[PDB]
Amino acid sequence: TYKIMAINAGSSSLKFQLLNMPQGALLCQGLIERIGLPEARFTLKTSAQKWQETLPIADHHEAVTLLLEALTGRGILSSLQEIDGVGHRVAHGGERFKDAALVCDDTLREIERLAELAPLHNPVNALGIRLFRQLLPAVPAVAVFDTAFHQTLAPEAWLYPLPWRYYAELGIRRYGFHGTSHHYVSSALAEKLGVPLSALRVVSCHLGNGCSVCAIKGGQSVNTSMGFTPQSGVMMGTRSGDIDPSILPWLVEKEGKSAQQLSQLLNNESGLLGVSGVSSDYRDVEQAADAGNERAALALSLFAERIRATIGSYIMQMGGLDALIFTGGIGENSARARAAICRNLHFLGLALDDEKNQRSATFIQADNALVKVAVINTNEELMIARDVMRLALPQ
Amino acid sequence: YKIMAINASSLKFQLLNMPQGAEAVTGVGHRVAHGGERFKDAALVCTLREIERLAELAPLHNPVRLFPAVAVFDTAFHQTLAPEAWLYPLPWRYYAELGIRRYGFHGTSHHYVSSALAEKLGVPLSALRVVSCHLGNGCSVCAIKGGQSVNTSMGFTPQSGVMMGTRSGDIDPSILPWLVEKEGKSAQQLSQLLNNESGLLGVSGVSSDYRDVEQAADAGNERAALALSLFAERIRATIGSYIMQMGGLDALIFTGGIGENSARARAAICRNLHFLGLALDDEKNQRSATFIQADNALVKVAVINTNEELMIARDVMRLALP
Ligand SMILES: Nc1ncnc2c1ncn2[C@@H]1O[C@H](COP(=O)(O)OP(=O)(O)NP(=O)(O)O)[C@@H](O)[C@H]1O
Ligand SMILES: Nc1ncnc2c1ncn2[C@@H]1O[C@H](COP(=O)(O)OP(=O)(O)NP(=O)(O)O)[C@@H](O)[C@H]1O
Numbered sequence: 010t011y012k013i014m015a016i017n018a019g020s021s022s023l024k025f026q027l028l029n030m031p032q033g034a035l036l037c038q039g040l041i042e043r044i045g046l047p048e049a050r051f052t053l054k055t056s057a058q059k060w061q062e063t064l065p066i067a068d069h070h071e072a073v074t075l076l077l078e079a080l081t082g083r084g085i086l087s088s089l090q091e092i093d094g095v096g097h098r099v100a101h102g103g104e105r106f107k108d109a110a111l112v113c114d115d116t117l118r119e120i121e122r123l124a125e126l127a128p129l130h131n132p133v134n135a136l137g138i139r140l141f142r143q144l145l146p147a148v149p150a151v152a153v154f155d156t157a158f159h160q161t162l163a164p165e166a167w168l169y170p171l172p173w174r175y176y177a178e179l180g181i182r183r184y185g186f187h188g189t190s191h192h193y194v195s196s197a198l199a200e201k202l203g204v205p206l207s208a209l210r211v212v213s214c215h216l217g218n219g220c221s222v223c224a225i226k227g228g229q230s231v232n233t234s235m236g237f238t239p240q241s242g243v244m245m246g247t248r249s250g251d252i253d254p255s256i257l258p259w260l261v262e263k264e265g266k267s268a269q270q271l272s273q274l275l276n277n278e279s280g281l282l283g284v285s286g287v288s289s290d291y292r293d294v295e296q297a298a299d300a301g302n303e304r305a306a307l308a309l310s311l312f313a314e315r316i317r318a319t320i321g322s323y324i325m326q327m328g329g330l331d332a333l334i335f336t337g338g339i340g341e342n343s344a345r346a347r348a349a350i351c352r353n354l355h356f357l358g359l360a361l362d363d364e365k366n367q368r369s370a371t372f373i374q375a376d377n378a379l380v381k382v383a384v385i386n387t388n389e390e391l392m393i394a395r396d397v398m399r400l401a402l403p404q
Numbered sequence: 405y406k407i408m409a410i411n412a413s414s415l416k417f418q419l420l421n422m423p424q425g426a427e428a429v430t431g432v433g434h435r436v437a438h439g440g441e442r443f444k445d446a447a448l449v450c451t452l453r454e455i456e457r458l459a460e461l462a463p464l465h466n467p468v469r470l471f472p473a474v475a476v477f478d479t480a481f482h483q484t485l486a487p488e489a490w491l492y493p494l495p496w497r498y499y500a501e502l503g504i505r506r507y508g509f510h511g512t513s514h515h516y517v518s519s520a521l522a523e524k525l526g527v528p529l530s531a532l533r534v535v536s537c538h539l540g541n542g543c544s545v546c547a548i549k550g551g552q553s554v555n556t557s558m559g560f561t562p563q564s565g566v567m568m569g570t571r572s573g574d575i576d577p578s579i580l581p582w583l584v585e586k587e588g589k590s591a592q593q594l595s596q597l598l599n600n601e602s603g604l605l606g607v608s609g610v611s612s613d614y615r616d617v618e619q620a621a622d623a624g625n626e627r628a629a630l631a632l633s634l635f636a637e638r639i640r641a642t643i644g645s646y647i648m649q650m651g652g653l654d655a656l657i658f659t660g661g662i663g664e665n666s667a668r669a670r671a672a673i674c675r676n677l678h679f680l681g682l683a684l685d686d687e688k689n690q691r692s693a694t695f696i697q698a699d700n701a702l703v704k705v706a707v708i709n710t711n712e713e714l715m716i717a718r719d720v721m722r723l724a725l726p
Contacts, residue, residue, distance in 0.1 A: 253492065253574070279495060321647060
């Protein structure tokens with residue numbers, strides 16, 4: 010048994026999980042938020058207890074110190090030397106990183122190098138790596154990149170139809186994200202079916218606050234809906250996904266919107282929130298819709314249609330479909346969303362069993378369906394801990 | 405019996421005897437680029453100053469009286485789209501206050517070729533689930549179910565959807581703010597990027613013309629080869645969306661300068677579609693026969709020459725000489 014810590018550092022936050030491996034049992038989890046701001050709060054939960062404290066937390070350096078002190082001060086660990094490894098979520102690995110990587114000092118520089126491509130995320134992700142190496146010098150660390158799973162896309166899937174130099178010189182191409190999630194659920198599906206992933210054509214829908222769809226054929230990602238950044242693809246909580254690109258120059262001429270305002274339009278005011286006028290939260294929009302808000306109902310319907318259109322593209326590209334996976338906050342819990350997405354797919358041999366779908370059973374396809382339809386809880390931290398075991402503790 | 409079809413730094417004309425269909429101009433039917441939301445069909449002209457009110461949305465084409473007449477709108481066929489197909493997931497007010505939504509174009513072409521397909525098969529068009537591919541310098545796909553357009557790939561303007569001669573089609577919208585921030589692009593520079601510099605031209609760096617790109621790829625140019633693959637993938641991804649939406653497919657139509665003539669393009673688009681019952685017959689595809697599916701195929705695949713002028717004439721004949 011090994012004790013592996015999975016870390017996810019944000020602009021103002023620090024999420025962590027401590028796992029018992031290789032079984033994957035959750036020892037503790039928690040969140041430090043509002044770092045460097047007032048209302049800074051530290052929440053820490055075990056299997057059995059919860060602790061919560063509002064207190065000043067200056068920077069991420071102070072956030073990490075409080076985490077480590079609490080692990081022993083709450084009796085979770087007898088000592089910090091019991092930690093066998095740390096995995097860190099990194100937003101963007103560009104083309105450099107095709108897999109999770111052992112953290113030496115010029116994987117950190119490489120991650121810093123890519124900062125240009127994930128400005129709000131990669132710098133702080135690297136800061137986390139730095140702090141833990143400083144405060145946990147003897148513990149090996151692994152970086153797990155949200156883009157790495159998608160590096161098997163072929164050129165005709167990642168090249169945008171712009172002038173060649175926009176890729177050759179500026180790096181503009183599809184990257185895709187949620188890589189760690191799509192990887193985790195597709196491998197989990199294969200173990201539940203008792204067949205290897207290489208035998209199945211799989212479409213994976215990660216539907217949360219951010220949403221993306223991924224086509225997995227022969228064990229490899231061959232397409233995915235997010236692109237150059239996590240804004241694009243299907244409709245999301247506050248992100249519009251794909252729209253007519255010519256709308257943007259129109260809006261600049263018309264409303265004088267800056268680049269920062271265009272990006273805020275696309276990332277923070279669109280999606281469920283922008284269409285419903287109600288909320289970014291699926292449950293809130295659905296509640297409003299059943300009370301007769303027609304914009305809210307339209308929002309939910311458009312949400313399902315955008316996902317259907319993307320699934321349809323990927324089934325075409327693979328030449329058929331053997332399994333469809335739902336995951337994320339919406340995909341795991343909304344029988345209604347899943348039903349709307351899966352309706353009228355007899356041309357694929359795909360239909361749902363209503364009773365199974367209503368209780369979110371693992372498999373929800375109908376008795377005579379040719380396509381397996383799975384509801385799988387995603388567990389990205391578990392997937393990170395397994396990357397730590399694989400690359401830092403190879404025995 | 406004597407119908408003229410007008411399309412106006414140009415002025416193209418055509419006069420046909422119906423119904424067999426056999427200043428600068430020193431019944432008639434007039435091509436109009438954008439009909440917005442108020443024209444669901446061709447319209448006897450009288451309409452003219454609401455046409456010009458729509459110049460806001462088609463400034464380069466609509467404004468361009470000199471000449472019974474009927475206006476035919478390239479957007480009109482697509483006004484049967486439901487809101488899930490035309491509403492972008494932007495803040496509501498961008499549709500409700502500024503009219504931003506999908507309109508779609510090539511409506512006359514898609515309408516003409518889909519009706520021609522049904523006539524050749526001897527069934528009502530509403531009996532079929534059809535995907536229509538207008539592939540020329542401009543490119544677009546249209547899904548016709550129950551005899552009505554239910555989706556189409558061009559959006560707010562003819563710039564978007566699939567990859568074309570010089571137009572990019574759809575791309576990650578986040579690229580644009582990034583290009584402004586990192587290269588200071590102006591709103592008009594963005595437009596000519598998306599409209600004039602991309603597509604087959606931009607990727608290949610050889611030509612906007614499919615044939616030119618084709619020749620350069622067979623001589624070993626690798627950007628050219630990649631441009632032709634991407635071109636095909638964009639169309640396939642869109643066809644796949646519309647098959648999903650319609651719940652299946654009865655027929656696939658190819659038209660326009662590329663679709664009517666390029667066996668290569670059609671073969672690459674139809675590759676590995678046995679899960680649909682769609683496969684091509686090499687011999688028929690090679691000579692662009694009217695039907696090119698294999699004889700075991702369940703999906704019909706047709707090559708139909710689009711005839712927008714003759715479709716326009718049938719519209720004035722219907723609404724001006726009933
Ligand atoms: N029982 C439920 N029924 C419907 N929607 C739910 C339910 N539980 C949660 N959600 C929605 O799921 C979404 C939350 O997704 P979640 O996967 O938890 O996002 P996240 O953890 O912030 N990161 P990400 O998944 O990448 O967006 C929100 O829209 C919630 O309203
Ligand atoms: N025999 C051919 N083989 C392949 N491509 C062809 C052939 N003949 C014409 N083309 C293509 O036809 C394209 C333009 O087709 P065409 O339908 O005439 O466009 P258009 O007349 O300008 N109007 P539009 O339909 O909007 O594109 C050119 O880019 C050529 O690549």
